[PDB]
């Protein structure tokens, strides 16, 4: 719940190792976990808040000019000077024009000339940085098992809104009864700050990395402005017209807000009005789950005469939900839910609500479960067999495995070696795979990066051809490995 229809959702099986399960979760998706007991929790990530930023840089985007002084010496005696070249607030440039008696001076040469202009600034880029503290991730962890009002509605108080910061720890959270859950986040292995720059324009903000933002044109100014206006650039902005021979002139280059946006394509955007409201990015929890009842075992198989009040409602490969309305004298009991096959009973499904439970009286409790890939009879009644429902999950086994392989390829994509940490309880194989892909993606790190969609797929096809030319069985670690990783990376990036 709070997790239905938000597809790309991260099913997690297994709790072994005692209780610890490694989960990598991000703003876009959410994670549903399972175990043989200890009922299914839902991990949705919501807003990140970096509390205390520090302003590192001001770029001017629109500028205007005034007071427009200029001067010229004489033909080759004197190179011109001007007293308002003294301020660096003025922009200045030397050039050479021509001079003669017509101009008045004498000696008929190509004499030097200066021009000067006062530099005033319009609205700016207010680029800031944040340390890898003063930032909190807010995670709503919410349980299944009933409580209508909406298997969606992330707004609402059913799942606790627990904060976490790198100045914090094991993240103890409490729920109704059973839900003492401890979460050990590792936020420093997340976005890897001290390589980030939040970038605020007039209304919006973006998250761009640091070297690019330092390397960008559109005049420099450091964070100690106040009475600054000391812009140490302006060859990238204001341009000086020089016609054929005579007097040169100043030209404001105009607002580069559109060119700025075209520059920061391929970068995630962010609302930043109230301090900060940082979004899309991932983090890595280790999850410990001892401390968990099943919201009572402590009950009976119920009497009977249930009633559906909602449809069949298939979501996203198998997860189907059914909202039943108990009728009778329950004194709240369990719900005898089963997913069976046909006659000569071969009961084969799974229930992801584990131990669903009726509330006090009439209240439309709802149940999600996964049938197999074909025919299925979902049954809920007992003594007069009360209610069966037919259902046909279209599916496949092979198609399900192939889609899971595509999910694993997308995890070999965007989220890095954290996606090797996305499983759990792996011991030897998972850890050695994470270390091997760590050093391997480090070699394919910076290290052949910085390239666009087109050039990546083109360098992929040329390197897969030179692998196809087949010398001495280097063609494998060439051609097939490199062609797979380049193509399945290039067609998936720039999202």
């Amino acid at each position, epitope marked *: 719940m709070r997790c239905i229809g938000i597809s790309n959702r991260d099913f997690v099986e297994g709790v072994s190792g005692g209780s610890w399960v490694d989960i990598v979760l991000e703003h876009g998706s959410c994670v549903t976990t399972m175990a043989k007991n200890k009922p299914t929790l839902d991990f949705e990530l919501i807003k990140t808040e970096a*509390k*205390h930023p520090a302003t590192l840089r001001k770029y001017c985007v629109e500028a205007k000019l005034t007071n427009t002084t200029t001067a010229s010496r004489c033909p080759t005696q004197g190179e011109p000077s001007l007293n308002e070249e003294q301020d660096k607030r003025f922009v200045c440039k030397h050039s050479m024009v021509d001079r003669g008696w017509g101009n008045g001076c004498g000696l008929f040469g190509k004499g030097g000339i200066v021009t000067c202009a006062m530099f005033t600034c319009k609205k700016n880029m207010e680029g800031k940085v944040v340390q890898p503290e003063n930032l909190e991730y807010t995670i709503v962890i919410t349980p299944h098992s009933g409580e209508e009002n909406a298997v969606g509605n992330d707004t609402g108080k059913h799942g606790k809104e627990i904060k976490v910061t790198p100045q914090s720890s094991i993240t103890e959270a409490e729920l109704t009864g059973y839900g003492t859950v401890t979460m050990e986040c590792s936020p420093r292995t997340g976005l890897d700050f001290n390589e980030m720059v939040l970038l605020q324009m007039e209304n919006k903000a973006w998250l761009v990395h640091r070297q690019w933002f330092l390397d960008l044109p559109l005049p420099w100014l450091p964070g*100690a*402005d*106040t*009475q*600054g*206006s000391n812009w140490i650039q302006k060859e990238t902005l204001v341009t000086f017209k020089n016609p054929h021979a005579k007097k040169q002139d100043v030209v404001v280059l105009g607002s580069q807000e559109g060119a700025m946006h075209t520059a920061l394509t391929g970068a995630t955007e962010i609302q930043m009005s109230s*301090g900060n409201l940082l979004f899309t990015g991932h983090l890595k929890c280790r999850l410990r789950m001892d401390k968990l009842q099943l919201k009572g075992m402590s009950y009976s198989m119920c009497t009977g005469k249930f009633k559906v009040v909602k449809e069949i409602a298939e979501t996203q490969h198998g997860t189907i939900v059914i909202r039943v309305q108990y009728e009778g004298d329950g004194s709240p009991c369990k719900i005898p839910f089963e997913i069976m096959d046909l006659e000569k009973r071969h009961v084969l499904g799974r229930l992801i609500t584990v131990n669903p439970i009726v509330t006090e009286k009439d209240s439309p409790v709802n149940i999600e479960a996964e049938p197999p890939f074909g025919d299925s009879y979902i049954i809920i009644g007992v003594e007069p067999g009360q209610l069966k429902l037919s259902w046909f999950k279209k599916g496949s086994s092979i198609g399900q495995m192939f889609e899971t392989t595509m999910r694993g390829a997308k995890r070999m994509a965007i989220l890095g070696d954290t996606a090797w940490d996305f499983g759990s309880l792996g011991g030897v194989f998972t850890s050695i795979g994470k270390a091997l892909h760590q050093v391997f993606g480090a070699i394919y790190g910076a290290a052949f990066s910085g390239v666009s969609w087109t050039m990546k797929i083109l360098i992929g096809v040329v390197i897969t051809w030179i692998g196809m030319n087949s010398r001495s069985t280097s063609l494998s670690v060439s051609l097939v490995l490199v062609g797979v990783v380049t193509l399945y990376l290039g067609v998936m990036v720039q999202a």
Partner: antibody
Amino acid sequence: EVQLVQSGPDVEKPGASVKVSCKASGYTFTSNYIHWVRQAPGQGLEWMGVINPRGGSTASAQKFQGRITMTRDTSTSTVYMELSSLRSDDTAVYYCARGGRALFYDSYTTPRDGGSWWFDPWGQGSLVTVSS
Amino acid sequence: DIQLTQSPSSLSASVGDRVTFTCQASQDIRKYLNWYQQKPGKAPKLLIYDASNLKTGVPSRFSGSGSGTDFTFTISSLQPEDVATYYCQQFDDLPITFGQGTRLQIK
């Protein structure tokens, strides 16, 4: 003793610039920052800006963007504030004190506090009136 | 920014009363707060630093408390030399902002 002394009250023209001094006594002049705070009579207090005596970096608030300048004299242990583009709203009482010092340079907040803003060492007050 | 609201704006009380002031911040200012008195047209004086600590030379009738955003200043026994305008002040994040003020009147 622990003491600061400011200059006398001044009256200037609109669009002019005014200079207010702040002389120190009783301590080592590069062991504290100096900060300038205004107060209009029909208003409470309002922060203008910050200078460091050791070295001489400055900063100021956004309401004084490009209107204020801060210098010093280490030999006389004195801090000068110069407010430019005077208008009628600038008629106020001016104040200058001492911050506990991140040794090198200004504007820090994480060393446990400044510790006053600004009434322990501060002085006697400079009234500035912008009129014709 | 960090809007700092000071409440109430003005009070009147008799000599010997206990009076409390409340300042609220729009952000977390966890301990960075200061309390000042100001005698009108005079040279004013610090009362409380770090929102909990007396300055040496200040009498013990003054106190302050509060952690998150809401802060309480307290005079235990009001005395006739304590008629002043009282200010609370944030120190955090440095567009340094004062409270509006709180005037006192002796009954």
